[PDB]
């Protein structure tokens, strides 16, 4: 069983100079610690083998964090709210060299989340689906992870049909944001390597561990 009540509780449980690049790296490292506490609260995750928990978090941490700060920014006016508390707007992002990826995040994620009024239960279920990624390489039992994912979007569909009975396509609309999250995550990861490779931007321990094999 995969109760949406616990997934929402997981989202609620992890709720809390002005250079965008440095703040991005600081925010990612900061939220990696919070991501572990979140995953532990997702039903049945901690029951997986320890090595599989590592595989799933190493494979999805980037998308998981991107989904979080995107939904967190639905109230911001054409901007992104990073975990450090810094609001990055279009002018600041463009001047920092990350104008393109910034635009994608707002048009393909933040604005789409705001327009459909994606709630925290739906967000937590999407992040849980991402967490339970059966395509992750090295999983000792990918079928087991696939079963957990199936339970997640089974409970999500039931939630959407009960909460939004007049939006029959809402469930599919939620899942159809995952392709954008996938490609956006890949581009964001490229910028993180731009920041690290140049050696000019500080990279803290946890984020450094995720960026290395």
């Amino acid at each position: 069983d995969m109760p949406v009540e616990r997934i929402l509780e997981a989202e609620l449980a992890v709720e809390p100079p002005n250079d965008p690049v440095t703040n991005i790296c600081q925010a990612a490292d900061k939220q990696l610690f919070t991501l572990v506490e979140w995953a532990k609260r997702i039903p049945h995750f901690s029951e997986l083998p320890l090595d599989d928990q590592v595989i799933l978090l190493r494979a999805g941490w980037n998308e998981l964090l991107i989904a979080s700060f995107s939904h967190r920014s639905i109230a911001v006016k054409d901007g992104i709210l990073l975990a450090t508390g810094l609001h990055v707007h279009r002018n600041s992002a463009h001047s920092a060299g990350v104008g393109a990826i910034f635009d994608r995040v707002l048009t393909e994620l933040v604005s789409k989340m705001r327009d459909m009024q994606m709630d925290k239960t739906e967000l937590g279920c999407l992040r849980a689906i991402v967490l339970f990624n059966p395509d992750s390489k090295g999983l000792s039992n990918p079928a087991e992870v696939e079963a957990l994912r199936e339970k997640v979007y089974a409970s999500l569909e039931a939630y959407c049909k009960h909460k939004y009975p007049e939006q029959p396509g809402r469930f599919a609309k939620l899942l159809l944001r995952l392709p954008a999250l996938r490609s956006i995550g890949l581009k964001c990861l490229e910028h993180l390597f731009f920041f690290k490779l140049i050696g000019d931007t500080p990279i803290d321990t946890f984020l450094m561990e995720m960026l290395e094999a």
């Binding site: 572990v36 320890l50 590592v54 321990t205 561990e209």
Partner: peptide, 12 residues
């Protein structure tokens, strides 16, 4: 460092 992810998942 020292499998910070491993140790964070282990500790309760």
């Amino acid at each position: 460092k020292h499998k910070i992810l491993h140790r964070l998942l282990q500790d309760s």
